[PDB]
Amino acid sequence: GSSGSSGMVDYYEVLDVPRQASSEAIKKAYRKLALKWHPDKNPENKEEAERRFKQVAEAYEVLSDAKKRDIYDRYGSGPSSG
């Protein structure tokens, strides 16, 4: 892909890893992004990094997890709840 896709936020695709990406492959592929789009590392692009890091962190925080990931891969995301 030239750039990717604009719209939804697919963790796996956000962390630059396949749907079957192994934990190690998810962390090794995320840790690089979390620090690549970090607001403390990207001063000039802090505005962008501050947003990219938000999706990247949530992605790994859900995939790297055994409970959040399973739920995500299984269902993913439901409608307004509460």
C-beta atoms surrounding 68 within 10 Å? 14
Could you tell me the two tokens for 2? 């030239």
Q: How far is CA 81 from the centre of its chain?
A: 22
**CB contact at 8 A, 64 and 58:** no
Question: Out of 2.60.120.10, 1.10.287.110, 3.40.50.2000, 3.50.50.60, which CATH number does the structure's domain 9-82 have?
Answer: 1.10.287.110
Per residue, what are the HEC states of the chain? Answer: CCCCCCCCCCHHHHCCCCCCCCHHHHHHHHHHHHCCCCCCCCCCCHHHHHHHHHHHHHHHHHHCCCCHHHHHHHCCCCCCCC
Contacts with 69 (C-beta within 8 Å, 6 or more apart), sequence order: 62, 63
Experimental approach: NMR
Structural domain boundaries of the chain?
9-82
CA quadruple 42, 48, 54, 59: dihedral sign: negative
The Cα 17–Cα 31 span in angstroms is 12
